[PDB]
Structures are given as C-alpha cells and as structure tokens.
Amino acid sequence: TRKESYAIYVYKVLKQVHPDTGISSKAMSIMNSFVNDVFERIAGEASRLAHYNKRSTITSREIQTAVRLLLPGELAKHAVSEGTKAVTKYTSA
Amino acid sequence: TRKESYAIYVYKVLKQVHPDTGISSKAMSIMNSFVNDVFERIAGEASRLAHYNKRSTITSREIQTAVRLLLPGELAKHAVSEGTKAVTKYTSA
Amino acid sequence: AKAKTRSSRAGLQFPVGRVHRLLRKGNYAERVGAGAPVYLAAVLEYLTAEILELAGNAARDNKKTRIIPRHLQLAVRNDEELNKLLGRVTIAQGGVLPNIQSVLLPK
Amino acid sequence: AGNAARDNKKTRIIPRHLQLAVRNDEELNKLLGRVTIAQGGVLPNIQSVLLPK
Amino acid sequence: KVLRDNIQGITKPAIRRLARRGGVKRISGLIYEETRGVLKVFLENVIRDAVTYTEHAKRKTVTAMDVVYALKRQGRTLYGFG
Amino acid sequence: KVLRDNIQGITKPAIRRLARRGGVKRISGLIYEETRGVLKVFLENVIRDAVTYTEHAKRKTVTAMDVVYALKRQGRTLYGFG
Amino acid sequence: KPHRYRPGTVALREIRRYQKSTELLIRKLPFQRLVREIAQDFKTDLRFQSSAVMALQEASEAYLVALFEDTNLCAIHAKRVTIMPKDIQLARRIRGER
Amino acid sequence: KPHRYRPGTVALREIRRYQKSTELLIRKLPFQRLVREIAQDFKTDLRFQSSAVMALQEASEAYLVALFEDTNLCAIHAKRVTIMPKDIQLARRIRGER
DNA sequence: TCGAGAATCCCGGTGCCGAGGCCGCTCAATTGGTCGTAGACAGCTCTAGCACCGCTTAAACGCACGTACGCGCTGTCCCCCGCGTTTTAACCGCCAAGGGGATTACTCCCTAGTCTCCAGGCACGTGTCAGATATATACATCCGAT
DNA sequence: ATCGGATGTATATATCTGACACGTGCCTGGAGACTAGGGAGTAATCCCCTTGGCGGTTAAAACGCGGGGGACAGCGCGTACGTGCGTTTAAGCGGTGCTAGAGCTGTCTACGACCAATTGAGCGGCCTCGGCACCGGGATTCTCGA
C-alpha cells in the first residue's frame, strides 16, 4: 500500500541545518506526526475563521492570520516573514 | 436580514415539557448558542470519524457512535433510543 | 402534491430540513445520511428537554414562571451528567451554585 | 535536536534529545506542553527542598 | 487620548467582593495587585486575539463574537452572545 | 479465559520507580492502591473509547491509532504511531 | 456600648449573599478603561461593543472567582484561613498557567 | 561494621538515575493482562497490537509520573516530604479529574 | 572534619541492525485550457459607538483596632527508606494456528444536483403581566453578659 | 450553656413596566419530484499479527527489618486582616449629538475547479555498515563516621 510521509524532506532540511547528523526512524515518525498535527491545526483554524468570515476561499491572508493566532511571538513573526518571502518567490514566476 | 434561530422550537419543547413555565430571552439565546455548540461538536466528531473511515458519506451510525463518544454514560443510552425511534418513525414513513 | 415536513414525519419539533441545510453548509462530509438530521435533532430535543426541565424545576422552586439564567446555572451544576457534559462551559448571568466548605463554618 | 545530541556526543539523535529540547524551549513547550512524547522521559528537574544537607 | 493605570482602577473592595463570591474568608494584601497582574495577563491574551479576529475582520470596532471565538480557541467558551 | 485482579499486578516497587522518576522522595502506603484506582479510572476511559473506534471500525483487534485518536479527543495526544 | 461582630462573620454573610447574588462585582467604567488601555498596546484606536466588553468582564470575573475558589481550597489544604500568594501561583501551576 | 546509607539517599540516587533513564518502569506482561482484563469489561475477546499496548503503557506511565510530579509539588506546598492520598485527590481536583 | 567505601563516569572493544542509500515503479503532481462564480470593490445607508456633559449616589479609601490565624518551635511516633533475603514471572525466545484485516472486484442505493412551488419562519408591531423594586414587618441568628 | 439585644434577612404588599407572549404579511428554504454516479456494501482471498502456549533467569517483587526523620500535635505571639465607621469619589442614568464604520446592495473579474494529458518525485523494497548499545574494567567522586 502506497503510504505517504515526509521523512525524506525531514532528512533534506536536516542536512540543510545539520549535515553530519543521523535520526532514529522513531524520531522521524514522531516529527512526521507533529507535522500532521500542526497541519490539521492550522487548516481547521483557517476553515473556522473563513466560516466566521463566511469565506469559501482559504488564502494566504487566512494562513498568516491563523499562524499568528497559533504561534507565539517571534515564532509567529519569523513564520509569517518566511511564508511571505516564499509566496513572493513563487508569485515572482 | 432574516436571522434564523430555534426559539420557536425551544419554546415548543418547553411547552411539551412545561406548558406552565415561561422563558427569558437571555436564557433563550443561551439555549440557542448551546445547541449550536453541541451540534458543531457532534458534526466535527462524526466528520473526523468518517474521515478515519475515509467515507465521504455521513450516516446515522456515525451519529450514534459519536454521540456515545460525547455523552456521559446513560444520557447517550437514553439519547440513542429516541434517536433510533426517530429514524424508525422516519423509516416507517 | 401533499406536503408533510420531515419533523412531522418524525412527529418532533426541531427542523430536520433546516438542520440538514445547516450541516450541508457546514462542510463536514460530501454526502449525508438522510436520517442523520432526524436522529441528531431528536437527540437535541431530548437533551434540551432535560435541561429546560431542570431549569423550570428551579424556576417554580423559586416561584418563577419565566426562567432566569441563574436557574440554568443551578440546573447544569446540580446534575452530574450534564455538569460533566458542560464542565468547561460558562454561562452568562450564571453565578455559582451554593457551596460552603466544612471548615468555613465557625465552631 | 542536533544541539542536544552533539552535547551528548551523539550523531544519531534519539527521541530523548528531542524531548529535552522541547522542555528546553519555552515557546515551543507552550505549543507542545499539551503533547505527549514517546521515549521522552522527563527533562531533569530537581526541587529545592529535595536536596540533602 | 492615551490611557494608563486603569489596572489599579480595580478596587480592593471589588477584589474582595469577587473573593467572597468565590467563598473566601481571610485574604492578604499581597494578593490584590498580584491578582490584578494575572487579570491583566489573562485579558492580555484575549483582546489581542480578539482584535486579531477584528484584524482579519478588517474593521475598526471590536465585537463580542471576537471574544467568543477567542474563549472558544482559549477553551473557555461562553454563551449568550450569538 | 476470564481475567481479574491484574490491578494489583502493579508492583509497589513499580509505583515507587515511577514516583522516583517523577522526583519524589518520601511516599506513604495509602497511595499505591489509590494510585492504582486512578490508573484504572484513567485507562477506564481510553480503552472503551478506543474500542469504540474499533466499534465503528467493525474489527476484532484493537489498534494503536484507536488510542491515538482517543488521547487526541482526550486532549492528551501522543506521537510516534502514525 | 458599641457592638462589633466577630471577624469574618460580616465577611461570612458577604460570602453568603454573593453566592446568593449573581450580577457583576466590578465597576463597569474602570474595567472598560483597563480593557482599552490593554488594547492600545496591540493596536491603538480600536472600538468595542458594549456587549463585547460586558462579555469580557463577565468571563474574566468568572475565571477570577474560579481562581479564588480553588485557591481557597488549596489554602484549606494549607490549613489556613488566610490566603498566600504562593497558593495562587501554584494553583495556576496546576492550572497549567505557568 | 555494616554500613547503611541514610534514608532517602539511595532513593535520591534512584530519582537521579530515573530522570537519567527514559525506558519504561512497568513490567510488560502484568500491564498487558490488566489491559485485557479491562477490555473484557466492555467487550470480551478483543485483540491488540503490541504497538498499541506499548502506547497504552507509555502514555499511562507518562500521566502517572506527571501526577506523581505535581503531587510532589503540592506536598512541597504541604511542607512534607511524605506523600498523602489527599494530595493526589486534590491534585486531580485541580486537574479537573473530579 | 580526612578516609572507606560505594555508586558512578569514562575508556576501549564487540557486535547489529536500524539509518540510510539506491532501485524499480508508479500515481499523483504538473500543465494547460475553460468556466462559472467568490468576492473585490464601489458605493450607498444608519447606528452603534464614541464622546460630552451633568446630576446623584452608592460606592470606594483609609483608620483605627481588635484579634486570631500564620507562623515558628518542640517533642513524639511511627513509618517509610534502605538493605538483606527469598520467591516468581516478565521476559524472551521460539513455535503455531487462524481469524481477522486488508484487498479487489463487482453492483447498485442512495445522495448530490435541478427545478417548482409554497408555507413555515422571520421581521415586525402590540397589548400586557412576571417580576423588579420599595416598604414595613416578622423571623433567625450572632455576640456578649451571666 | 442562656438570654437579651442588634442586626440582618425572608414576606406581603402595590404598581410599573418593559420585556414578552402573541399575531402578520411576506419571504425562500424546505419540501417534492427527477437524474446520475459511485460511495458504499459484499464477497472471496491472502497474510499475517495475534493470540495462544512452553521453559529458563533473574531482575524484580515480596516481605521483613530497624530506625532516624518528619507528620503532627501542641503552644506562644504577633502581625496582618476583618470591621465598622468615618471620609471622599468616580460610577451610573440619561440624554445629546456625529459619524466611522459596520453593514447592506450591485457589479465584474480573476481565480481556482476541473479535467485531461504527462511523469518524475517519491515510495515500497533491498542491501549495508557504523554509531550505538552493551560490557568489563579502571578511575572519580558523594557520604557517612572521625
């Protein structure tokens, strides 16, 4: 059964931050579960706020607002800046 | 702008239980908000379960299961009975 | 073309059609069980009946025809099952149920 | 996690390192204090009156 | 119109009234300001989150449904306001 | 094969081991069984809810993802099991 | 000769009537000014619903009496009738507020 | 002459090494038997994943050490090094477990 | 308090399997049209908020003061820590059976989607009594002398 | 332990009323009827995880066993806190008035939806080998009696 995960991108960004490091597959699964958790969190919050806004379209403004609702302080600030830079890069082409 | 509610229905069931006892609008809107909240509770739970079942359809079995998840013991039991009654009364239509 | 609402078809009060439209617009599942609105609305009818009944109990316990939110707080705090159901829930104009601890009384 | 593991002179990073880092970052902890961690254990926390004399 | 120091606008009689409602007999002074702080801290979140809603609401006035959804997200939901 | 009394199968040495992990020095006896009870009560929920999942799962074996979604619904989510 | 009730007694009756009463115990305007002061910290010149701020104050006071309640309980476990700040702090600690 | 460390000291080192260690402190089979005993109460003859029951025991023990931890803390507020059942009960009380 | 002793830290060496890397092998991601539509936006209201200001007053702050719980200290009991011994069953490793879990392939029942019509719901007026409020009263209960 | 006095509180009464029950005309969501697809349901197949047992081990649990350590009870005092009474103070009513901004309608348009054609990013599966786990042994450091 074709099962999808992210541990490959985990290894990728690890090498991006720590090239000389290994991981326990256990820890990889833990991190992936964490990925899923934050994803469902942000998605549910975005859908809920759009419902409050009666919006049927979830866009990057919703993304940023919901992250700010979720992440604290500089975590949220850096995340907002990063998402902004990335969507700017993608929209540049 | 038409704003839907259930004050009619809550008053109906009030009379059905207490034809004598009155009702305040404050507590009325309290009832309305409460039932909205619990309906969203059951909706989210059943949708979550069906997503776990990966079943795009939401049926009554889901409702029974999820309210059993929701209600503290005997309530649910009592609850499900009338619910069954309902669908029986509606399946016997 | 004889008309009969699903609530009457269930002989109940809560609007099966309205709640069905609501859950449809609620974006929870693609298709729905046609009897699920009936079932859920029946459950709502039941629980609402119990809570309003206890509310009216407190009300005429206080010679009060029109029920006050304080009656609601007292009701939801008395029943174990309903309190458990609504423990982390707050109620406007609720107040606190009567509760004095043992050592609070002077000897 | 890499910080913790290298502090422990470890290349392969075990869940214990991650749990320690979790309970070491206050904002991340706040985000994840409601979350449980497999093979997490408890970050070393010693109470004052617990000490001998 | 820059506001300030309304935290001490909370009267110690008010605090002790709330305490008596909570069923408290004897209280110390050190609590009240401490209390106040907590109060502040508590509301410190919600309003911001609330106006955060209003942030996305693109509006200048702040509404109840804001704090409704906040307390909801704060797991302290309230009834009676839509 | 009807089971029973595995609650006392929890050894007092095990309990005190967990306590030492929690950083506890001196303990009384009255705790352990009390402890056990709580333990039971605690698990009292999850398994049921878990098998409730398995209930809707229409299956005879019980899986981890059951307790995963339980602890999730119990607000005590856990990682490392899919 | 002047009469004075024994300590707590008057406060005891106050407790009794406050568990009897249900309305707010905070003056509206000071609370509102505090809220707006807090608001300008995150963004200045923001308006509010009277219903909104009534909700704020009610929900606050609810949380506050709950804190006072369980801190009273803890002080019972502290075997004192006087309250101590540490009781509140550790209560928040158990309330996960630390 | 025989030597005996002063009380707690050995238990203190036990605490230290247990905060050092991370593995389980409960024997597997007894826990599993307990789980199956609990299961047959709701429905008999139900099977389980070893992963599932490992998760059960880990999550339990986590909740349990958390309870032991904050009850230790409360006992600090109780100014005792010995634990009392009331500490656990009231801790659950603050934990909303009552 | 300087040693004895004990639990521990660390070092080297052994052996291992999970971490990882690579390999077939897709289906899910991309690309590109195409279309109906969510909302972006403009442009109107109007109203609820926002502030103004005055008037009354219940309320708040502070004082003095008794006082009584918090706190600090002592001695006791008992009791839980630590260690020693004895018993056991968790574990671990292996085996085995099957029963359920997952899979795929059909098959079609039910729901989404459409269109029609209207009737229950909703905004909106409208008398009107549940109860809010105030007052005098009768009952309950504390506090101090006896 | 009681009685007397003070005080605070539950009651009846009167009326005021403004929420509130009640009824309307009008609206549209709900019902009713019809069509399609395809999610769901069923069934046969495979696998294979689980549940069961069996034997040996010991680390672990049971149990016992002092015994110092603190839980606890009591006991003095004192400072901090209720209280009732002073004081002054903003709180609330209320009513005024402006409008900024919600809050509504009407476009029109960019924007995914969606489908179709294409495929390489990714995933199950297969080696592989090295940090890592274990072990044994030596050296270090805490601790309890001087």
CSV table of N, CA, C and O (backbone and C1' of nucleotides) in Angstrom, one decimal, chain H residues 4-5 7-11 13 20 27-30 33, chain I residues 5-9 80-83 89-91 99-100:
chain,number,residue,atom,x,y,z
H,4,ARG,N,25.0,1.4,56.3
H,4,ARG,CA,23.7,1.7,55.7
H,4,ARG,C,23.6,3.2,55.4
H,4,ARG,O,23.8,4.0,56.3
H,5,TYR,N,23.3,3.5,54.1
H,5,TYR,CA,23.2,4.9,53.8
H,5,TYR,C,22.0,5.5,54.5
H,5,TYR,O,21.0,4.8,54.8
H,7,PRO,N,18.5,7.5,55.1
H,7,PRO,CA,17.2,7.4,54.3
H,7,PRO,C,17.2,8.4,53.2
H,7,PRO,O,17.7,9.5,53.2
H,8,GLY,N,16.4,8.0,52.2
H,8,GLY,CA,16.2,8.9,51.0
H,8,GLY,C,17.4,8.9,50.1
H,8,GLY,O,17.2,8.9,48.8
H,9,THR,N,18.6,8.9,50.6
H,9,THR,CA,19.8,9.0,49.8
H,9,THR,C,19.8,8.0,48.7
H,9,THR,O,20.1,8.3,47.5
H,10,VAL,N,19.6,6.7,49.0
H,10,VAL,CA,19.5,5.7,48.0
H,10,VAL,C,18.3,6.0,47.1
H,10,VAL,O,18.5,5.9,45.8
H,11,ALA,N,17.2,6.3,47.6
H,11,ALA,CA,16.1,6.7,46.8
H,11,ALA,C,16.4,8.0,46.1
H,11,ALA,O,15.9,8.2,44.9
H,13,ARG,N,19.3,8.8,44.8
H,13,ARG,CA,20.1,8.4,43.6
H,13,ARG,C,19.1,7.7,42.6
H,13,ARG,O,19.4,7.8,41.4
H,20,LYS,N,17.5,10.2,34.8
H,20,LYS,CA,18.5,9.9,33.8
H,20,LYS,C,18.0,8.9,32.7
H,20,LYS,O,18.1,9.1,31.5
H,27,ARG,N,6.6,-3.7,34.3
H,27,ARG,CA,6.7,-5.0,33.6
H,27,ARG,C,5.6,-5.1,32.6
H,27,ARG,O,4.4,-4.9,32.8
H,28,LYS,N,6.0,-5.6,31.4
H,28,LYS,CA,5.1,-5.6,30.3
H,28,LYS,C,3.9,-6.5,30.5
H,28,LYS,O,2.7,-6.0,30.4
H,29,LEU,N,4.1,-7.8,30.7
H,29,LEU,CA,3.0,-8.7,30.8
H,29,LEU,C,2.0,-8.4,31.9
H,29,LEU,O,0.8,-8.5,31.5
H,30,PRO,N,2.3,-8.0,33.1
H,30,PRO,CA,1.3,-7.6,34.0
H,30,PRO,C,0.4,-6.4,33.5
H,30,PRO,O,-0.8,-6.5,33.6
H,33,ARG,N,-1.9,-7.9,30.8
H,33,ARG,CA,-3.0,-8.6,31.4
H,33,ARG,C,-4.1,-7.7,32.0
H,33,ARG,O,-5.3,-7.9,31.9
I,5,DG,P,37.2,0.0,53.2
I,5,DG,O5',35.8,0.4,52.6
I,5,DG,C5',34.7,0.8,53.4
I,5,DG,C4',33.5,1.2,52.5
I,5,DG,C3',33.3,0.5,51.2
I,5,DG,O3',31.9,0.4,50.9
I,5,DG,C1',33.6,2.7,50.8
I,6,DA,P,31.4,-0.8,50.0
I,6,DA,O5',30.1,-0.1,49.3
I,6,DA,C5',29.5,1.0,49.9
I,6,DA,C4',28.9,1.9,48.9
I,6,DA,C3',28.6,1.3,47.6
I,6,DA,O3',27.5,1.9,47.0
I,6,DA,C1',30.2,3.0,47.3
I,7,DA,P,26.4,0.9,46.1
I,7,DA,O5',25.9,1.9,45.0
I,7,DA,C5',25.4,3.2,45.3
I,7,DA,C4',25.8,4.2,44.3
I,7,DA,C3',25.5,3.8,42.8
I,7,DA,O3',24.8,4.8,42.2
I,7,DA,C1',27.8,4.5,43.1
I,8,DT,P,24.5,4.7,40.6
I,8,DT,O5',25.7,5.5,40.0
I,8,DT,C5',26.1,6.7,40.6
I,8,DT,C4',27.2,7.4,39.9
I,8,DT,C3',27.2,7.3,38.4
I,8,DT,O3',27.5,8.5,37.8
I,8,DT,C1',29.2,6.5,39.1
I,9,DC,P,27.2,8.8,36.2
I,9,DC,O5',28.5,9.7,35.8
I,9,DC,C5',29.7,9.5,36.5
I,9,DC,C4',30.9,10.0,35.6
I,9,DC,C3',30.6,10.1,34.2
I,9,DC,O3',31.6,11.0,33.6
I,9,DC,C1',32.0,8.2,34.6
I,80,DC,P,4.3,5.1,55.8
I,80,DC,O5',5.2,5.7,54.6
I,80,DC,C5',5.9,6.9,54.8
I,80,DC,C4',7.4,6.7,54.6
I,80,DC,C3',7.8,5.9,53.4
I,80,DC,O3',9.1,6.4,52.9
I,80,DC,C1',8.6,4.8,55.2
I,81,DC,P,9.6,6.1,51.4
I,81,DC,O5',11.2,5.9,51.6
I,81,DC,C5',11.9,7.0,52.4
I,81,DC,C4',13.3,6.5,52.7
I,81,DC,C3',14.1,5.8,51.6
I,81,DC,O3',15.5,6.2,51.7
I,81,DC,C1',13.8,4.4,53.5
I,82,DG,P,16.5,5.7,50.6
I,82,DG,O5',17.2,4.4,51.3
I,82,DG,C5',17.8,4.5,52.6
I,82,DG,C4',18.4,3.2,53.0
I,82,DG,C3',19.0,2.4,51.9
I,82,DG,O3',20.1,1.7,52.4
I,82,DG,C1',17.3,1.2,52.9
I,83,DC,P,21.3,1.2,51.4
I,83,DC,O5',21.4,-0.3,51.7
I,83,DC,C5',21.7,-0.7,53.1
I,83,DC,C4',21.1,-2.1,53.3
I,83,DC,C3',21.4,-3.2,52.3
I,83,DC,O3',21.9,-4.4,52.9
I,83,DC,C1',19.2,-3.2,52.8
I,89,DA,P,4.1,-15.1,39.9
I,89,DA,O5',4.3,-13.7,39.2
I,89,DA,C5',5.6,-13.2,39.0
I,89,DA,C4',5.8,-12.8,37.6
I,89,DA,C3',4.9,-13.5,36.6
I,89,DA,O3',4.9,-12.8,35.4
I,89,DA,C1',7.0,-14.5,36.4
I,90,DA,P,4.0,-11.5,35.1
I,90,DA,O5',5.1,-10.4,34.6
I,90,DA,C5',6.3,-10.3,35.2
I,90,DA,C4',7.3,-9.4,34.4
I,90,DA,C3',6.8,-9.1,33.0
I,90,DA,O3',7.5,-8.0,32.6
I,90,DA,C1',8.3,-10.9,32.9
I,91,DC,P,7.5,-7.5,31.0
I,91,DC,O5',8.7,-8.4,30.4
I,91,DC,C5',10.0,-8.4,31.1
I,91,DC,C4',10.9,-9.4,30.4
I,91,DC,C3',10.8,-9.4,28.9
I,91,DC,O3',12.1,-9.4,28.3
I,91,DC,C1',10.7,-11.6,29.7
I,99,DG,P,-10.6,-19.0,13.7
I,99,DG,O5',-10.4,-17.9,14.9
I,99,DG,C5',-9.2,-17.1,14.9
I,99,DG,C4',-9.3,-15.7,14.5
I,99,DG,C3',-10.7,-15.4,14.0
I,99,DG,O3',-11.0,-14.0,14.2
I,99,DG,C1',-9.2,-15.1,12.3
I,100,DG,P,-12.3,-13.4,13.6
I,100,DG,O5',-12.2,-11.8,14.0
I,100,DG,C5',-11.0,-11.4,14.6
I,100,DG,C4',-10.0,-10.8,13.6
I,100,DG,C3',-10.7,-9.6,12.8
I,100,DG,O3',-10.0,-8.5,13.2
I,100,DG,C1',-9.4,-11.1,11.4
